[PDB]
Amino acid sequence: MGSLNQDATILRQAKLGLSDPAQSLSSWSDVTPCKWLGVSCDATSNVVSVDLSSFMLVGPFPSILCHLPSLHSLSLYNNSINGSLSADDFDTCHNLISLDLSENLLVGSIPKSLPFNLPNLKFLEISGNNLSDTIPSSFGEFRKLESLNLAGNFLSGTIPASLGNVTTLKELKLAYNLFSPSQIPSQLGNLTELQVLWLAGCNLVGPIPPSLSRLTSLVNLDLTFNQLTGSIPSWITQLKTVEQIELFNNSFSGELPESMGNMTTLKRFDASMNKLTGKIPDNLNLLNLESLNLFENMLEGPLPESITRSKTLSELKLFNNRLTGVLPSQLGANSPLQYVDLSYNRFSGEIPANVCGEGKLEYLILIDNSFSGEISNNLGKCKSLTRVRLSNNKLSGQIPHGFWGLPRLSLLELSDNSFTGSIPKTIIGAKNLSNLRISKNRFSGSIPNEIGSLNGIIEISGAENDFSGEIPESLVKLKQLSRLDLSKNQLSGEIPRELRGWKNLNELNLANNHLSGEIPKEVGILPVLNYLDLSSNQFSGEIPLELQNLKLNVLNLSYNHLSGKIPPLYANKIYAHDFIGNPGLCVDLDGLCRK
């Protein structure tokens, strides 16, 4: 009874100093306090832990909670605790082992006196506030702290060297603050029990200090988004329990450490956006690897065959390097490949036929390589695909039939290859298709009517092919269509007269075909049309006056069979290049007509 009374009163007093607009603490408003929401007790009925995570509470830090004599854990994670921390707020909190103030609205400085007032803490988190000024050097006095998280504040100055005296630390998270440009303090090498070191976005310069080789229990080393220089040190390779190395967006130079191949525990490795040279290490035995990102470097040589030993690999992004050679033929057969982006390299030979062997591949991005041969019929059945970009390669043959109708495919980009064949009617199944980009190929036959059923289409880009027959009337009711480019084909017939469905059409390019009839008057009523190119066709009749409504970046009606007068808005000689090659046309230059 005694302890239930005490606890209930202190808890109610604390609650009175907060605003609770979500009624999260209604249970504190019959029942023993040991069963109130967020409240845990020990066997003698004393409150030991108060967890008010995500309760939408507003107001100053409720330091009255510290008057509970057995309180060991306090979490106010993700509320609206506001104002600043004073020295006084923590005077009575000296029994705490765990304190979580992350994701609140706190401002101002960390009190210098915090370690003195909270000497028993093992876990301190104040991540995601607006804390400013420096991390106090007194933080070097904590005798028991295991985890420190100050990530995502406006803390400035530099990371204090005295943190190296907190040799009980297992996690140190200081990422995304406003520190001055400085080196990683060498003294952090004394934190020999560290498992997590997260100093992303900390304005770090210079090398990773050699002392950090003493951090032999590292599991996650994350130094992303800094300006670190020199080699990625080869001691990361001998970490027996390393799972994650994140070093992207730095200025690392030299080569990937040669013996990376033996890091059997490694799950994720990202050293993208650096200045790495040399080759991808070979004899890979990266048994646990899930993600390998090495994009935007100056890597050369091949993707080693031994990558296929990584039977859990799901993400491989190597784009923007100078990699060469043929891909390992078995790539993807034995891995749940999800995201593959090898663009802007010099790869050659065929696309591995089972890149989607496990049925998980979503992105297949191979732009700007010299891949040759055909797309495997396998890929025609890769139903998980959303984003395919195969442009600017040396691919040939007919596209696999089912590829056109994949149910989740959003971007299909095949441009600048030598693909042949007609677009099949199975394109009707591509319900999610947004962008069809197939220019600069040898596709033949007629544009199938079913492309008009794909209501989401925003782009049909088919220039420089061998398309013939008519533009299907169906395209004219694609409400979201932004860009229609079918220039340099063999299309015939007319443009449909009813075009009000084209409310989003920004570009209409049908130059260099065999199109006939009149330019329909409704071209000029399209609300966002900025590009119109109908040149090099057999359009006849008069240029509609409604074109004068539009603000056209490009207007080109040259090399047709058009007649009558040029609309008066375009009568100046600066637009003359728009209308050349229409022998029947003239300009009304002050009275008579000039050809």
């Binding site: 995304y176 997260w198 988004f225 993208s272 956006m273 993600s291 990102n293 993400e315 991005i365 970009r389």
Partner: peptide, 12 residues
């Protein structure tokens, strides 16, 4: 919020 400690999501 704060970017997680995880792989870059950049891609083409």
């Amino acid at each position: 919020p704060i970017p997680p400690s995880a792989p870059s999501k950049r891609h083409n």
